Paper text:
To assess the conformation of the C-terminal region of Gα in the absence of intramolecular interactions we solved the crystal structure of MBP-Gαt327–350 alone. Although the Gαt327–348 sequence could be traced in electron density, it largely lacked secondary structure and the conformation differed markedly from that in the complex containing Ric8A. Thus, binding of Gαt327–350 by Ric8A induces the formation of an α-helix by Gαt335–346 and/or stabilizes such a structure.
Author numbering: 2 to 393
Write the structure that this text describes.
Amino acid sequence: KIEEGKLVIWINGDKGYNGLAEVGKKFEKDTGIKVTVEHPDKLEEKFPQVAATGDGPDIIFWAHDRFGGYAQSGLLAEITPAAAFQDKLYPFTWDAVRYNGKLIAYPIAVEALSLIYNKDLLPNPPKTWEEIPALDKELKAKGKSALMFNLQEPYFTWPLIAADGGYAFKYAAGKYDIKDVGVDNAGAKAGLTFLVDLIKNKHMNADTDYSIAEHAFNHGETAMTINGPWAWSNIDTSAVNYGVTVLPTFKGQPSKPFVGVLSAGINAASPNKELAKEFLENYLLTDEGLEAVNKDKPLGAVALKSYEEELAKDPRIAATMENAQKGEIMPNIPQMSAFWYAVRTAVINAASGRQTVDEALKDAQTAAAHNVKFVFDAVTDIIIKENLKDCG
Ligand SMILES: OC[C@H]1O[C@H](O[C@H]2[C@H](O)[C@@H](O)[C@@H](O)O[C@@H]2CO)[C@H](O)[C@@H](O)[C@@H]1O
C-alpha cells in the first residue's frame, strides 16, 4: 500500500542511502513531508513485483537499463520537467531515460566500472588482462592475490566478455535488433574463456561475491578489484592507498563496461507524484542534494552540469569516464532483463564448471534472443483460498 502524504524511496544498498536520507530530512523541514529511504535486497526485481499490483515505493532508484521494462509494464509515471530544468542536466542523460517517446525517470549520474588497484602491492597495474595470471603467481608466492571482484553479477564480467567483440543486442541506425544477440560470438567466447581460465587456474574463486571481493581488497589481501564509484568510500576508510584506472585490455582491445545512468523513477501508482517531482527536481538534483548523496557514496559523473564541473576534476571520475567512453550505454529495452538473466546464468555455470564456456554461451544466446521473455503481471501475486476473504 502506497501511503499518501509521505515519500518512500528505494535505492540499492551499495549507494548513498544515508546521504539521500539527509536530503529527505531537508525536504521534511521545508514541507513537513516525511521521506523514508529504504534499500531492499533484489531491488530491481522487487520493485516491478510489487509495483505491478499498485504498491511499492514512490520513487525507485536504479540504473536506467531496467526502466524500459518498468515503463512497458505501466509502472512509471511520465515525467515532464520544464525545459529550463532539463537544460541543467547533460542532454544525453535524458535520452537514457526516454522510452517510447516519454521521459520515464530523472537521470542522476553516469556509472562505469573501473580497475581499482592497491598502489603499495601493485604500483604499475596491468595494462592487459593477459598479464594478470603471471601477476597473481608472483603475488601468490608472497601470500597475496592479484584480483578479486564480484563474480555473481554479470555486470562485472561483461567488460571482459565485450572487449573482443561480445555484445548484447546488435544495433544500427537508431534501432536494436533484439533477436541478434552477441554473447556467443568468438569475442564473447574468448572473454568468458579467459575469465573461466582465471578461475580454473586458481587465480580467482567462482564463489567470490561483492562482499568477499570488497573485504579482500580493503584489507590488503588482493591487489586489484573491479567496482564502481560507490565503492570508493569504503576504500577511503581503509588503510589502502588505491588508484582508479582504465580496465585492462583483452586481445589488444579495451574492456567495454556497460554504462549505467543511475535514475530516479516515480511509481505510476504513487499518490505523491507532485511531492516526488518537487523532491527530485528541487532538492536532490541540486548541488547541495547531490553533494549530500555523493559524500556518503560517490555517484560517479553526475548528470547535473553545475556539480559535474566540480567532480570532473577528480582523477577517479576521469578514469570512470575513460572506461565509460570505451564501453556502451546500456539499452533500456525490456529485453535487457532476459539478457542479464542469460549472461548471469552463463557466467555462473561456466565459472562453477557445470557447463563449458561454449555450452554456457550457446545457451545464453538462445535464452536472451528466443527462450526467455519476462512479463510482469498482477495475477502472479494472487493466492487463491477457499474463502474469497483469504485470497490475495
Ligand atoms: O549484474 C547485472 C546487473 O547489472 C547492472 O546492475 C548494476 C547496477 O547498474 C549498479 O548500479 C550497481 O548496483 O551494480 C549492479 C550490479 O550488481 C544492471 O543495472 C542490472 O539491471 C543488471 O541486473
